[PDB]
Amino acid sequence: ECPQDWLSHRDKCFRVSQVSNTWEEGLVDCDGKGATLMLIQDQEELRFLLDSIKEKNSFWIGLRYTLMNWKWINGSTLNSDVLKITGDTENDSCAAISGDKVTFESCNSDNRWICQKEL
Amino acid sequence: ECPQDWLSHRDKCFRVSQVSNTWEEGLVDCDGKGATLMLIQDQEELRFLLDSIKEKYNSFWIGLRYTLPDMNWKWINGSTLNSDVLKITGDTENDSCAAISGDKVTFESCNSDNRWICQKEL
């Protein structure tokens, strides 16, 4: 059995954050619960979760990497004001669940997150 | 002195729900936590929570509800809703429930799926 107030599914306990915040704040929140950011095991896991949650925000998952001449489809370069909010100082890219898909965005965006524990 | 994982503000504690579900499910969820669905003292209190949650477009059930009589539902053109549409219109309880949505309180059918805020008084 899982701890109180954690969703159960197969071998895993899940917890969904109360608040929205950076990818890093979600990861440090999870560690503090002795958990980690959700690592999607399969389509069935994800849909189950989303069925229980019924959200209509994104959720940060345990995926991050570090990314370039950015151009629009017409050939013109992205000006800096746009670069500002397409990305961040660190030029990292952090993954979130937004419905049944995995989107990628600046780690400084505010989303909710899911923490997981292996029972 | 607020329980762990409750948000602290003046002499109140708040907890936002992990999940979205009916107004009644939130009512009962909070009761099981020794709390009630949020009762708003003032706008400051509403803004604190929003600035905490950082989700100013979602809807949050609070502790306010009314019911209606059973209604003869017509379209704006004056014609009657046929039974096949009435089967998926509104809810059994003919109720409407209050929800925070940004700096406002709107009413929505009580069978919608929204997150909720429970409050305890600290």
Side-chain angles (χ1 to χ4, degrees):
Chain A
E1 27 51 299
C2 289
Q4 108 173 351
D5 255 73
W6 289 65
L7 278 46
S8 229
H9 195 54
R10 300 143 71 177
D11 56 330
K12 286 164 93 181
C13 305
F14 303 101
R15 203 191 179 114
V16 198
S17 60
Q18 277 183 79
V19 145
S20 290
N21 216 331
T22 66
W23 187 91
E24 183 188 15
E25 286 289 329
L27 187 57
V28 166
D29 173 63
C30 296
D31 302 348
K33 284 157 182 59
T36 199
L37 272 175
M38 189 187 183
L39 312 166
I40 301 160
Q41 180 163 41
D42 52 50
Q43 277 264 57
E44 199 283 320
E45 205 200 39
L46 182 55
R47 293 190 182 180
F48 168 85
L49 275 138
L50 294 169
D51 280 351
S52 310
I53 295 168
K54 314 204 218 297
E55 184 77 334
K56 86 192 218 189
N57 305 313
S58 314
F59 308 83
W60 294 126
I61 55 165
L63 190 54
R64 173 172 185 273
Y65 76 111
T66 284
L67 288 151
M68 295 200 70
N69 215 326
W70 288 96
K71 294 174 180 309
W72 296 108
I73 62 176
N74 75 342
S76 64
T77 309
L78 267 60
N79 82 67
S80 336
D81 204 31
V82 194
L83 284 169
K84 274 172 211 148
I85 18 75
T86 57
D88 55 38
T89 294
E90 312 80 359
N91 194 34
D92 55 22
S93 183
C94 280
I97 296 152
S98 166
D100 219 58
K101 47 173 176 164
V102 169
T103 69
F104 280 97
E105 63 201 71
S106 149
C107 307
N108 283 338
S109 313
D110 300 306
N111 297 314
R112 300 177 65 199
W113 58 93
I114 302 174
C115 303
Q116 77 173 26
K117 275 179 139 128
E118 297 255 40
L119 207 208
Chain B
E1 212 184 321
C2 288
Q4 208 198 332
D5 295 311
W6 292 61
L7 273 43
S8 232
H9 198 63
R10 307 203 207 107
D11 278 314
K12 295 175 156 197
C13 309
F14 308 94
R15 175 108 168 231
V16 191
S17 68
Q18 291 186 54
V19 95
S20 294
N21 206 325
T22 63
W23 185 86
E24 182 187 23
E25 288 289 292
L27 182 87
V28 173
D29 169 60
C30 299
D31 189 11
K33 283 181 170 42
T36 187
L37 277 165
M38 192 191 164
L39 306 182
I40 312 173
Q41 202 173 4
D42 75 296
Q43 306 192 15
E44 194 279 330
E45 197 201 32
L46 185 51
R47 286 189 321 263
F48 166 83
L49 271 171
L50 290 164
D51 305 338
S52 253
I53 294 174
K54 304 191 158 131
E55 288 160 45
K56 211 249 271 176
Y57 306 73
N58 293 129
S59 265
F60 294 96
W61 292 138
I62 68 179
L64 175 54
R65 174 177 178 269
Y66 70 82
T67 61
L68 300 175
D70 314 289
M71 312 252 207
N72 196 32
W73 288 132
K74 312 176 183 180
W75 305 112
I76 48 169
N77 78 351
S79 61
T80 280
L81 268 76
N82 77 44
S83 47
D84 186 47
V85 177
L86 295 163
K87 289 183 208 138
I88 62 173
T89 295
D91 50 40
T92 34
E93 338 101 300
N94 251 74
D95 53 356
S96 192
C97 288
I100 289 158
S101 177
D103 50 5
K104 267 156 47 255
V105 177
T106 43
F107 300 93
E108 291 182 37
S109 299
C110 301
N111 60 344
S112 322
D113 286 315
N114 284 320
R115 294 180 72 190
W116 58 92
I117 302 147
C118 308
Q119 76 178 36
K120 279 152 165 284
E121 298 213 303
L122 170 32

